[PDB]
Design a protein around this ligand. Sequence first.
Ligand code: HOU
Lengths: 126, 126
Amino acid sequence: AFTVTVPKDLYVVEYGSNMTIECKFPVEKQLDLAALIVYWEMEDKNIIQFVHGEEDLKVQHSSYRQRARLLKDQLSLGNAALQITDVKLQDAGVYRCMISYGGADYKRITVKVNAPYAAALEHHHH
Amino acid sequence: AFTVTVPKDLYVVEYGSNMTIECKFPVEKQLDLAALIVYWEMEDKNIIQFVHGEEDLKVQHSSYRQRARLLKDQLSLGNAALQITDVKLQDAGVYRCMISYGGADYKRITVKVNAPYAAALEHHHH
Ligand SMILES: Cc1c(-c2ccccc2)cccc1-c1nnc(Nc2cccc(CNCCO)c2)o1
């Protein structure tokens, strides 16, 4: 029974801080990047797609260019970690990590962003 | 290049009718049930999980208890079709057909429910 598990299903982050959200999956023996697909989406926006050993930038949403990365190194430990730098109020919401390695499964994580008045004000006047 | 395709991305169904929403994936030669995982979800509510050889109800959202089934027969033709019997207003929303058969992909399907006043009235209050 191939299962994806999330240590924390809810992260609370401060505006402008850095965030790492984890998804754990079981890895037997040595990791076979060829058979691994890691996909992170956030409310119908592709964040990262890791397939065939490499990330696909052709589909990455431009809002996450050069601020969202998968910690490729941690995949060998069965850890699919997404790191988003410079967290903004627009990053609050429901993330999904979908993994395909033998089986397939997925989990949802919720992110809340605390912000001072100033940052909230600019976000409000969109 | 593994693609899931949906003939219709929007279904309009009448309250109390039966609904089937189609989801296609490419299957060359013979289908390998061992490698197929089909997930149907509806706005972060799991409807069905088809893993290994048969669907798993272990996590089915109660709102779909005993009203949603996967048409196993058509999986061989690359058709992961979900059937909801006795469609209700709460079945309106965005469905997700997630499939892993070699590659992995998913498609969103939107469902609208037309209803007479009486059913709308009862749905509105409870
Ligand atoms: C469904 C899935 C699973 C999965 C499959 C079956 C059950 C549970 C999970 C696992 C890993 C990756 C994916 C996957 N799903 N596909 C991608 N990446 C992607 C990149 C760009 C665009 C799109 C399509 N966006 C919706 C419109 O088609 C998807 O990850």
